[PDB]
Design an enzyme around this catalytic site. Structure first.
Site, mmCIF file in Angstrom:
data_model
loop_
_atom_site.group_PDB
_atom_site.id
_atom_site.type_symbol
_atom_site.label_atom_id
_atom_site.label_comp_id
_atom_site.label_asym_id
_atom_site.label_seq_id
_atom_site.Cartn_x
_atom_site.Cartn_y
_atom_site.Cartn_z
ATOM 1 N N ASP A 25 65.175 50.513 8.258
ATOM 2 C CA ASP A 25 65.664 49.182 8.620
ATOM 3 C C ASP A 25 65.295 48.174 7.541
ATOM 4 O OD1 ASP A 25 66.399 46.837 9.825
ATOM 5 O OD2 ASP A 25 65.303 47.200 11.705
ATOM 6 N N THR A 26 66.205 47.966 6.573
ATOM 7 C CA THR A 26 65.909 47.062 5.470
ATOM 8 C C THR A 26 65.863 45.600 5.900
ATOM 9 O OG1 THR A 26 68.260 46.988 4.819
ATOM 10 C CG2 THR A 26 66.839 48.622 3.713
ATOM 11 N N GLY A 27 66.397 45.272 7.071
ATOM 12 C CA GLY A 27 66.287 43.935 7.610
ATOM 13 C C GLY A 27 65.004 43.638 8.354
HETATM 14 C C1 XUY Z 1 65.819 45.912 15.555
HETATM 15 C C2 XUY Z 1 66.978 46.559 14.812
HETATM 16 C C3 XUY Z 1 67.214 47.960 15.377
HETATM 17 C C4 XUY Z 1 68.247 45.726 15.004
HETATM 18 N N1 XUY Z 1 68.192 44.470 14.285
HETATM 19 C C5 XUY Z 1 68.362 44.504 12.838
HETATM 20 C C6 XUY Z 1 66.990 44.330 12.187
HETATM 21 O O1 XUY Z 1 67.073 44.547 10.805
HETATM 22 C C7 XUY Z 1 66.475 42.910 12.430
HETATM 23 C C8 XUY Z 1 67.284 41.872 11.646
HETATM 24 C C9 XUY Z 1 66.592 40.514 11.811
HETATM 25 C C10 XUY Z 1 66.746 39.734 13.109
HETATM 26 C C11 XUY Z 1 66.044 38.393 13.280
HETATM 27 C C12 XUY Z 1 65.197 37.820 12.155
HETATM 28 C C13 XUY Z 1 65.042 38.593 10.854
HETATM 29 C C14 XUY Z 1 65.738 39.931 10.686
HETATM 30 N N2 XUY Z 1 65.112 42.830 11.933
HETATM 31 C C15 XUY Z 1 63.974 42.734 12.787
HETATM 32 O O2 XUY Z 1 64.081 42.570 13.969
HETATM 33 O O3 XUY Z 1 62.738 42.858 12.149
HETATM 34 C C16 XUY Z 1 61.499 42.526 12.911
HETATM 35 C C17 XUY Z 1 60.655 43.391 12.664
HETATM 36 O O4 XUY Z 1 60.146 42.972 11.275
HETATM 37 C C18 XUY Z 1 60.244 41.467 11.286
HETATM 38 O O5 XUY Z 1 61.059 40.965 9.963
HETATM 39 C C19 XUY Z 1 62.239 40.566 10.362
HETATM 40 C C20 XUY Z 1 62.045 40.178 11.809
HETATM 41 C C21 XUY Z 1 60.893 41.155 12.307
HETATM 42 S S1 XUY Z 1 68.955 43.166 15.077
HETATM 43 O O6 XUY Z 1 68.899 41.938 14.255
HETATM 44 O O7 XUY Z 1 68.354 42.850 16.363
HETATM 45 C C22 XUY Z 1 70.637 43.704 15.274
HETATM 46 C C23 XUY Z 1 71.660 43.455 14.190
HETATM 47 C C24 XUY Z 1 73.064 43.955 14.415
HETATM 48 C C25 XUY Z 1 73.410 44.680 15.730
HETATM 49 N N3 XUY Z 1 74.759 45.298 16.242
HETATM 50 C C26 XUY Z 1 74.539 45.851 17.539
HETATM 51 S S2 XUY Z 1 73.048 45.635 17.920
HETATM 52 C C27 XUY Z 1 72.416 44.898 16.754
HETATM 53 C C28 XUY Z 1 70.982 44.406 16.547
#
Ligand code: XUY
EC number: 3.4.23.16
Lengths: 99, 99
Positions: A25-27
């Protein structure tokens, strides 16, 4: 390996001696795993995602093997919808984005 | 290009005539953009992550240029704290994970 993205980038990880599936999860800044038992001390912390904030147990300096590559770093444990491997460990296994 | 993950993989995108910064996010199935007043029809959707769900508007066949690479697909608009480029568009620009 080179991983395309037409499917979820799910891989097998080993942590606490137990195998699990996790999402590259690069995000995600941090690595967040579903509720589990982990040995050693931990500190309570808060982390925010797309839907708000959750309480997690922060484990420091945890051994974790990701798709055959070893990392040692911080792992957050709490009510995440999915086991996610975040950039704190992706950097350790030498992961980059390429296009 | 090759993007290391020491910092957030933020890139410039062009959508609806606006330039914005967005995350190349291998953990996102779909593309989710901060609130913006796009024209055209849409349908409501709910997407869940850490912290819970948010309500978004689904726009189809939206043109989006990502770091100079053109793409067209579904874009979700809602109260997300970050612009997220998901796998539906990352595949279109030829993005892979490599380690
Ligand atoms: C959790 C994963 C599986 C799913 N997410 C993607 C993930 O990359 C999120 C992106 C993000 C969201 C809010 C702020 C910064 C970054 N990062 C995240 O939560 O990171 C946590 C942990 O580390 C911390 O740094 C960053 C924030 C903390 S999502 O956003 O909820 C998503 C997107 C499309 C989508 N299409 C159908 S469902 C769906 C669900």
């Amino acid at each position: 390996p080179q991983i395309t993205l037409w499917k979820r980038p799910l891989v097998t990880i080993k942590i606490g001696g137990q195998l699990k599936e996790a999402l590259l999860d690069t995000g995600a800044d941090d690595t967040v795993l579903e509720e589990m038992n982990l040995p050693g001390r931990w500190k309570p912390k808060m982390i925010g995602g797309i839907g708000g904030f959750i309480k997690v147990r922060q484990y420091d300096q945890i051994l974790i093997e990701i798709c055959g590559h070893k990392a040692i770093g911080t792992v957050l444990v709490g009510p995440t919808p999915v086991n996610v491997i975040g950039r704190n460990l992706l950097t350790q296994i030498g992961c980059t984005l390429n296009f």
